[PDB]
Amino acid sequence: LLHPLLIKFSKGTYRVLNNRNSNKFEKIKTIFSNIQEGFLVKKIINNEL
């Protein structure tokens, strides 16, 4: 059930690792920018897990 959150985290951290010549703090903020309360529930339902 928690796998979509892991996928989202992995996308964010791949972004930050591959970031070049930009503010690291900014990308670290983008990691947790669109994390929303209903994200896990919506992803659980829609992915038909």
Binding site: R15, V16, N19, R20, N21, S22
Partner: protein, 174 residues
Amino acid sequence: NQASKGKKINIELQVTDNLNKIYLKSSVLMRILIPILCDFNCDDDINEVLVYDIFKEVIKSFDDGKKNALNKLYKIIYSRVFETKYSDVVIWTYLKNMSTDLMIIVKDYFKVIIKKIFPKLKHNSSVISYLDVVIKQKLKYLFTFKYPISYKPLKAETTDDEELSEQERMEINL
């Protein structure tokens, strides 16, 4: 040129002191040409085209028509934009819906830098720092702007699920 020796040098990206001075000369000429172009009561679209072409021409005239400065400027903007492709692939995938591509951003940024940034260049100042800052900030602005309409690209693929989104969306309410 003295400061460029320490850092890793890429021949296409490096900006000589002479090129910085060429850009400054073009900046002075652009500033003195702006009021004349603004007073022209012709249509604004043809006026923007004329401003772009005229500023390109002042840079070329200071460049002896070599067009090397414009090539290096395009290369700078191209590098700054394409560096974010691998890292920020998600926002580029989303921006595909808005008909915005990396090369499109490069061309638009080229027009903006020649028209709305080069005139603002300060005397005896480094062009590369100002350009880096403005391009990176414009990329941040682009990735972080709230567009009026959220976009849902219907994936017409059935690799895993039995029915794709376009299929059901067609049959239900249309």
